[PDB]
């Protein structure tokens, strides 16, 4: 399907700067926001592979300009399986259909 990028940060000010710099660097759609405990917070963007690679790489460098900000894990899946959108919270919601 449409490519998915994830940036996991330790902290909410670092994950908002990650989410803000991703949709400002390229034409991606921030679709998701996932908390899994112990402050590990992940934002999920969708878009083309050129946009997601540019957004995640620029979103990673912007978190290390935040005091107390730390990137735990970043990943880009260029072509996720269509099974993944129904189970994992990486799919487009109706709140973000204007940005697709």
């Amino acid at each position: 399907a449409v490519a998915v990028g994830m940036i996991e940060t330790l902290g909410f000010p670092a994950v908002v700067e990650a989410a803000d710099a991703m949709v400002k660097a390229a034409r991606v759609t921030l679709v998701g926001y996932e908390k899994i405990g112990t402050g590990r917070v992940t934002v999920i963007v969708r878009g083309d592979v050129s946009e997601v690679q540019a957004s995640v790489s620029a979103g990673t460098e912007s978190v290390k300009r935040v005091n107390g900000g730390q990137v735990l894990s970043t990943h880009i899946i260029a072509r996720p399986h269509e099974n993944l959108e129904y189970v994992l919270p990486i799919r487009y919601t109706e709140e973000v259909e204007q940005f697709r």
Partner: protein
């Protein structure tokens, strides 16, 4: 510096290895009166600026002074997001 308006983004995947992680904004230059000039720039964006904002962009060797752009082949960099522009004691922007 020059005053510029963020008009878009430039994404390049085939680039130099020192150019990775650099966010590239397409900025159109604006005059002192606030009108868009027919002159643009692509600049590195350390200060996180989105589409429509007024930015200060420098030129040349000053783009390599922010201690992580030092050995990077950059000749343009957004150094400030403009809050307000006052011209002849009159607020023009902000």
């Amino acid at each position: 510096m020059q005053m510029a308006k963020v008009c878009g983004t430039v994404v390049g995947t085939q680039k130099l290895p020192s150019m990775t992680g650099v966010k590239l904004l397409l900025l159109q230059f604006i005059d002192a009166n606030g009108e868009l000039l027919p002159k643009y720039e692509v600049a590195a964006d350390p200060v996180g600026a989105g589409l429509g904002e007024w930015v200060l962009v420098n030129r040349g060797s000053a783009a390599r002074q922010t201690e992580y752009h030092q050995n990077r082949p950059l000749d343009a960099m957004v150094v400030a997001i403009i809050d307000t522009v006052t011209v002849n004691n009159r607020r023009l922007y902000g």
